[PDB]
Ligand SMILES: CC(=O)N[C@H]1[C@H](O[C@H]2[C@@H](O)[C@@H](CO)O[C@@H](O[C@H]3[C@H](O)[C@@H](O)[C@H](O)O[C@@H]3CO)[C@@H]2O)O[C@H](CO)[C@@H](O)[C@@H]1O[C@@H]1O[C@H](CO)[C@H](O)[C@H](O)[C@H]1O
């Protein structure tokens with residue numbers, strides 16, 4: 035018998051198949067590989083800090099959820115165990131792009147779990163009532179946003195507490211910020227996409243035509259339940275969280291579509307989260323941990339219940355009934371799978387955490403008019419370069 039520990043930050047909310055109930059099915063069938071999964075008791079950004087303290091203390095879990103944007107960071111801090119041959123055994127159970135994001139320098143450190151493509155959530159019934167359509171161009175988007183804002187309804191958000199992924203994702207839909215050239219990281223967060231995103235959100239904020247409530251504040255939930263928020267860009271895994279936040283408002287009326295051609299992106303979209311599960315330094319059971327993890331990550335209907343757009347290609351889960359009930363009977367998982375397939379490549383630098391922390395601060399100022407949306411991307415540039423220099427890494431800008 036071997037005992038495995040798995041630390042995760044899956045929501046485990048009402049209506050979901052709880053992680054402990056998924057693990058229970060494994061534990062009944064595999065007496066020699068016994069798993070205990072624990073939900074991290076803290077906000078998402080504190081989890082890799084806990085993994086670092088745990089690995090230093092010599093008491094880390096075997097397995098831990100690591101965002102794709104976090105892999106380079108935990109790799110650089112020496113937190114990962116090479117499981118290349120174990121991962122190769124399970125490669126055909128997963129999509130190639132997310133599997134590649136669990137790799138550094140031809141070595142694999144775990145299995146991918148989900149992807150986080152950005153899409154557009156909107157009240158389709160309300161759009162039809164108000165005489166509007168999903169805007170096809172940035173200029174149409176701004177004109178339509180001003181028209182709804184005149185009657186106290188909003189078709190866009192600017193979420194200062196989600197600046198890291200909302201600004202990097204909408205900008206990143208049209209090209210990378212970070213590249214590797216020989217020995218160095220090459221940093222440019224002021225791309226054509228960054229300029230386009232700043233221009234669009236600057237016009238929306240100048241015209242009081244996007245809601246600036248932080249995503250994780252009660253004001254965001256109140257905006258949905260009160261009927262004020264009738265459209266927003268959103269990460270695909272927000273679907274169940276958004277439904278719960280709505281408190282029944284819009285049930286049977288909403289739909290999902292692709293991110294529009296608003297930021298010079300055409301039919302492409304960006305990445306907002308999405309994670310794998312890494313094998314940590316000091317794990318005494320990588321082979322058994324990876325056997326369990328391949329099984330876990332291919333429990334497609336249970337993982338979709340948690341809001342995951344799964345990396346697994348072993349089976350296809352139907353849109354959960356809870357989601358299609360909310361979203362007008364729409365097959366929203368088909369829209370999420372299309373969005374995933376249109377997600378532009380976007381390599382993350384080690385220390386992207388620190389870049390997000392600084393971007394959040396500037397975005398609060400852009401939201402209240404004390405800074406420009408473009409300053410968020412300048413903050414990203416300077417904090418990107420300073421973070422790389424502080425990690426002792428070679429950086430060019
Ligand atoms: C990319 C990611 O992990 N997204 C999480 C999301 O994490 C953000 C939130 O916790 C907000 C709360 O304000 O904080 C952000 O971190 C800020 C931090 O607050 C600042 O103190 C610091 O200064 O800057 C950091 C940046 O380092 C977090 O980025 O939280 C949501 C809600 O809990 C998570 O759902 C989301 O992760 C995704 O969860 C899905 C399951 O619901 C999937 O597992 C998916 O793969 C995850 O990406």
Ligand SMILES: [Zn+2]
Pocket residue numbers: 416419431
């Ligand atoms: Zn500089």
